[PDB]
Each structure stands twice: as structure tokens, then as C-alpha cells.
């Protein structure tokens, strides 16, 4: 069985490269971040533009939703992150600590904490309520490409250009595991699987790897796409069949059969690097975003 993702809408508004698209946990909204210093809110089902969220002094590399779908955190080149109230568009807090561009960000399931990764080579844990940095992890020895909390917020996985993925204890800040690939290509993306048992890692050698991080073993490899120059978001599509969704430097959205590792679909549409893809929480909806020469976000729908 293969999905039949087809282009439903194209969202246009951003004036510079789109860096990140994320669906609100309630399925209602799609949030985008861009090099144009803006956050944009769109309808997840119709692609209808909702509002523009501004305040960052430089471009944004990532955006993430809180569990109740009320707040957003954004990661900026201005060296800060910002907590936003979605309904008002107001900046609740400006998180300051990093000494270089903030690349990635995420709320924990409870949404009382924020995890960020930066070009300054560290991982930071911030208090949502106060905007205070609770912990500074000396995570890596090169830029931090991704940060993700697991299912219960007990662990953090981080990735870096230094070639490693690391598993951290949220409470202690202690590094619990360092993943070694039997090679060192820069790790450009990482995330826990929905059940927190596996980690999906992207490397700058056109490869996606599904690791059992506890046992430190690679269980699945996904290739066939282009990824050597950008930190492209990858996903677990679990609404229908089980797929691996990723952007690619050839302007296509690649979809793989999770078990067989076979490419099941290649979505054409975009005219520049597909830097970001996101999967809708309850519906078979993919949101993809492209770089400078394109600047559009696309909504794709499948029957399975």
C-alpha cells in the first residue's frame, strides 16, 4: 500500500526563505517561521492566512507549539528565543543566554520547559513562566542542529555538525548516551519516535537513520533523496500508514515506507530546497516549506 498525497493549497506570504512549518497539537493551525523575521499563522485545513507575529530583530530558523496550542517559541539569529501568546500575537518573554544564532527549539509535553540548541554549541533548558534559563548543557563541539523532548519530557535528544546525537536527563542535565555511527557525518536532524523508544536522525550524506538509542543500534536506513547542505526536518507520519516524510535539496518531498525503507512517493511542486515538512496530528495532511527562490508553503492531502 502507498499514500496518494496531492497538492491541495499553496500558502504565499513570506518575503524570504521559509525555515520551519509546524501544526498546532489541536490540528487547527499551521505556524511558519522565516528569514523575513516573521511568524505566520494559517488554517491547517484550508491554508487561510490568519495573522503575522513580529518582534525578532533577525531571521528565524525554527518555531514550535505548546501542548495546549496557545503558545509558540521561535529560535532566532538575533541570539534569542521568544515565547508568544498566539491569540494576541504578543511576546510574553525573550529568552536570552546564547552567544550565537539560536537554531532549534521545542516545548516539553507538559509545556513548562523549553529546550533550545545553538551555533554557540550548547543546549539550553528554559523556564516558560519566568523566561529564565534553568540549565546550560555543554552539549557539543559544533553547531546544535536539533533538540527534541521525549514522550514524558524525561529525556532530550540533541544533534550536531560534530557528528553526534546525545540523550540527556532533563532533571539532572546529565548526558546518558552518545550515539556513534561507525562514521562521523554532520547530524542535521534528530527526533524521538512518538513512543520515545527510537530516534530518527538525518545526516549530511543523503541518509536518514532510525536508531534504537538505548541499545545504540540502527534498525532502518532511508536514502534516495538529496541532503548534504541543509538541516532538513524529517517526520514520522502515523495518521494512516507508517511513513517517513522528509524534504530534500532536489525540491521534492520524499515519503518512505517505514518498514520496507522503499520510496513510496516524491511530491513535486516546490522550486527550491524543501527545508521543512510537518505531519498533521489527526489527518493525513503534510505541510512542506521551501527556501529563498520559492518562499511558499504547500498543503498536501492523502486518503491513507
Amino acid at each position: 500500500v502507498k499514500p496518494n498525497y496531492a497538492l491541495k493549497f499553496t500558502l504565499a506570504g513570506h518575503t524570504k526563505a521559509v525555515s520551519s512549518v509546524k501544526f498546532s497539537p489541536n490540528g487547527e493551525w499551521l505556524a511558519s517561521s522565516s528569514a523575513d523575521k516573521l511568524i505566520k499563522i494559517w488554517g491547517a485545513y484550508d491554508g487561510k492566512f490568519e495573522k503575522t507575529i513580529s518582534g525578532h530583530k533577525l531571521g528565524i530558523s525554527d518555531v514550535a507549539w505548546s501542548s495546549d496550542s496557545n503558545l509558540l517559541v521561535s529560535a532566532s539569529d538575533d541570539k534569542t528565543l521568544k515565547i508568544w501568546d498566539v491569540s494576541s500575537g504578543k511576546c510574553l518573554k525573550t529568552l536570552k543566554g546564547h552567544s550565537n544564532y539560536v537554531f532549534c527549539c521545542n516545548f516539553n509535553p507538559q509545556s513548562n520547559l523549553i529546550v533550545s540548541g545553538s551555533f554557540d554549541e550548547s543546549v539550553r533548558i528554559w523556564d516558560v513562566k519566568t523566561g529564565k534559563c534553568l540549565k546550560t548543557l555543554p552539549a557539543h563541539s559544533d553547531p546544535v542542529s536539533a533538540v527534541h523532548f521525549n514522550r514524558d519530557g524525561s529525556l532530550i535528544v540533541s544533534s550536531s555538525y560534530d557528528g553526534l546525537c546525545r540523550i540527556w536527563d532533563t532533571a539532572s542535565g546529565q548526558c546518558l548516551k552518545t550515539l556513534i555511527d561507525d562514521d562521523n557525518p554532520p547530524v542535521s536532524f534528530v527526533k524521538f519516535s512518538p513512543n520515545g523508544k527510537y530516534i530518527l536522525a538525518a545526516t549530511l550524506d543523503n541518509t536518514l537513520k532510525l536508531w534504537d538509542y538505548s541499545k545504540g543500534k540502527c534498525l532502518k536506513t532511508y536514502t534516495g533523496h538529496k541532503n548534504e547542505k541543509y538541516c532538513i526536518f524529517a517526520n514520522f507520519s502515523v495518521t494512516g500508514g507508517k511513513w517517513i516524510v522528509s524534504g530534500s535539496e532536489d525540491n521534492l518531498v520524499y515519503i518512505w515506507n517505514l518498514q520496507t525503507k522503499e520510496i513510496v512517493q516524491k511530491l513535486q511542486g516546490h522550486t527550491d530546497v524543501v527545508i521543512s515538512t510537518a505531519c498533521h496530528p489527526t489527518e493525513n495532511i503534510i505541510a512542506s516549506a521551501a527556501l529563498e527562490n520559492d518562499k511558499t508553503i504547500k498543503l498536501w492531502k492523502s486518503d491513507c
Binding site: 524570504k16 526563505a17 525555515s19 520551519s20 517561521s33 522565516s34 528569514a35 523575513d36 523575521k37 533577525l58 531571521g59 528565524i60 530558523s61 525554527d62 539569529d77 544564532y101 537554531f103 551555533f119 555538525y161 554532520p186 549530511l204 548534504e228 547542505k229 541543509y230 538541516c231 527545508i275 527556501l291 529563498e292
Partner: peptide, 9 residues
């Protein structure tokens, strides 16, 4: 503009 929108060295 955004670090993520920029190619690796």
C-alpha cells in the same frame, strides 16, 4: 537572514 536557510560552508 536565517541560519537554517543558509548552505553549510
Amino acid at each position: 537572514g536565517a541560519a537554517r536557510a543558509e548552505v553549510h560552508l
